[PDB]
Design a protein around this ligand. Structure first.
Ligand SMILES: [Hg+2]
Ligand SMILES: [Hg+2]
Ligand SMILES: [Hg+2]
Ligand SMILES: [Hg+2]
Length: 265
């Protein structure tokens, strides 16, 4: 928590009387930034995070045929994910011997765990939880780091809340009525401090057990419960769909200046 001074740095003065974006919302109503290209100066942010010796954990589950996605996923993470910072990849897999041997940059490591415990608390400062059937195509960096973040679902970012595919059955712990909801977050990319991520996954797991005891299974299971949690425990940042895109399904709209992390065709 003690933070050394930034060095002198030369960059454009912020413009108080020029909006950052005129096409999109860049702050939530609980004053959490919404991360779009143009909002952040990455040099400032990199300094702040490097001066804290920040370590980022990146977790992926790769079960059965999903092991095939690891090579592209890790290679492209090496090009685009937290470059310059300490990174610890945790690959959770039923096929440890099939994990590809990917060459890592300095300060980057990978653990294979055969299939949250406290090993994370001792090893990393932040945890980022993503799906493996994806590739990085542009910068994903410390601009996302915060106590708790969710990402806007790319199919729903323009939708009204009544059209969100939340769990709508009142018998479910994930239940959200039609007049509630900020955003529709996708399960494929969330994170935060280790403490906040473990709170979330603990809460989701308990709610999911309660539903199962009541003989009910939520519509988009993990994602429905994620959405309920983030409704009731507001994220400290929200990532734009730059951070979770499918170009084959959704193209490349003007509102996206960059496509950073995308579905594999
Ligand atoms: Hg700006
Ligand atoms: Hg995780
Ligand atoms: Hg939950
Ligand atoms: Hg969850």
């Amino acid at each position: 928590e003690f933070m050394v001074s930034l060095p002198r740095m030369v960059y454009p003065q912020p413009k108080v009387l020029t909006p950052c974006r005129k096409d999109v919302l860049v702050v939530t109503p609980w004053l959490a930034p919404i991360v779009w290209e143009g909002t952040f100066n990455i040099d400032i942010l990199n300094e702040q995070f490097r001066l804290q010796n920040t370590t980022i954990g990146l977790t992926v589950f790769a079960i059965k045929k999903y092991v095939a996605f690891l090579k592209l996923f890790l290679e492209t993470a090496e090009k685009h994910f937290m470059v310059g910072h300490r990174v610890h990849y945790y690959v959770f897999t039923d096929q440890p011997a099939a994990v590809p041997r990917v060459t890592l940059g300095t300060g980057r490591q990978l653990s294979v765990l055969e299939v949250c415990e406290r090993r994370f608390l001792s090893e990393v400062d932040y945890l980022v939880c993503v799906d493996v059937d994806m590739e990085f195509r542009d910068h994903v960096g410390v601009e996302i780091l915060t106590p708790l973040f969710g990402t806007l679902h790319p199919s729903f970012y323009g939708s009204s809340r009544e059209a969100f595919t939340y769990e709508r059955r009142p018998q479910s712990q994930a239940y959200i009525p039609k007049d509630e909801g900020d955003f529709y977050y996708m399960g494929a990319f969330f994170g935060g401090s280790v403490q906040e991520v473990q709170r979330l996954t603990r809460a989701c797991h308990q709610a999911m057990m309660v539903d199962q005891a009541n003989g009910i299974e939520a519509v988009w299971h993990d994602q429905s419960h994620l959405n309920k949690y983030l409704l009731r425990h507001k994220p400290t940042k929200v990532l734009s769909p730059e951070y979770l895109w499918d170009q084959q399904l959704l193209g490349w709209p003007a509102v996206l200046r960059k496509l950073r992390f995308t579905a594999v065709p």
